[PDB]
Design a protein around this ligand. Structure first.
Ligand SMILES: [Zn+2]
Lengths: 143, 92
DNA sequence: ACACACTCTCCAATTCTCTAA
DNA sequence: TTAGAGAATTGGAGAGTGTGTTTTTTTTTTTTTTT
């Protein structure tokens, strides 16, 4: 494909859990202690108090470059927490002209998305005797 | 084997993309004026040839394009046949 | 194992030289 | 005077090898036990 489809998605998408009065696990709140390792991958609901909130900063989704000699643009998609930027124009037309041009990054055509990180902590009146309260990390994107 | 190298060659020049474009357009491209300086008009002549040279073969520096053209221009018989054909067209 | 620094090797691109038409 | 056949010199493509990385105050705000 010419470019990744993520570059032109102008919208965000979220799920809303089942109503408990129609009800399933997603409708039944869990305290932060009850979130065992079985739940990894599932959609759940959590009840607690927020402890701290970070301020907003951007995060890359698709990065854009420019090749100086052959005047051609290429894209890169980022998912992991880190990445290596490109440094060689591997385009077939650019290669067959033996045009070992240099790539440069551009913000004006890259795609960002807003990011924020928070932390949630169990209610004090639900802590069993002699234990220290536990907490979870929350991530938030989009609107 | 490693990939063979890519070079300028008389086939590119004799292609429709090549030298016929210059003779089809040079009368319309360049324009001298006594109303502008020697440096001005001299700078004007090299624009079209530089852009044409880039469009033909983006490999190398502009001087290298000219000095590469010298060799194949002197050696190749088919190119010389085309050139005597041009000057015969003017003799026609 | 994943980016780097450095070493080694082969092959063909290039120019130089000699010969004859 | 052109050109084409053969020899010598050089470039860098690219393949290979080895390597490195995770990890006693001194000053100042606040809670607590001690005279
Ligand atoms: Zn390029």
């Amino acid at each position: 494909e010419l470019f990744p489809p993520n570059l032109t998605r102008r919208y965000f998408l979220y799920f809303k859990p089942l109503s408990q009065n129609c009800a399933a696990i997603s409708s039944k709140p869990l305290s932060v202690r009850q979130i065992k390792g079985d739940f990894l991958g599932q959609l759940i609901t959590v009840r607690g108090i927020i402890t701290r909130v970070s301020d907003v900063k951007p995060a890359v989704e698709v990065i854009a470059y420019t090749c100086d000699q052959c005047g051609y643009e290429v894209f890169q998609e980022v998912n992991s927490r880190t990445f290596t930027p490109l440094s060689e124009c591997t385009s077939e037309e650019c290669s067959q002209n033996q045009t070992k041009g240099q790539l440069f990054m551009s913000t004006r055509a890259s795609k960002f998305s807003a990011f924020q990180e928070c932390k949630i902590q169990e209610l004090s009146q639900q802590v069993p005797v002699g234990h220290i309260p536990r907490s979870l990390n929350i991530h938030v994107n989009g609107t | 084997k490693r990939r063979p190298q890519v070079k300028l060659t008389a086939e590119k020049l004799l292609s429709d993309k090549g030298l016929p474009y210059v003779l089809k357009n040079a009368h319309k491209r360049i324009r001298i004026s006594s109303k502008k300086n020697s440096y001005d008009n001299l700078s004007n002549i090299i624009q079209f040839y530089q852009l044409w040279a880039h469009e033909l073969f983006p490999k190398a520096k502009f001087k290298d394009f000219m000095k590469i053209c010298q060799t194949v221009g002197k050696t190749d018989p088919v190119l010389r046949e085309y050139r005597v054909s041009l000057f015969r067209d003017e003799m026609g």
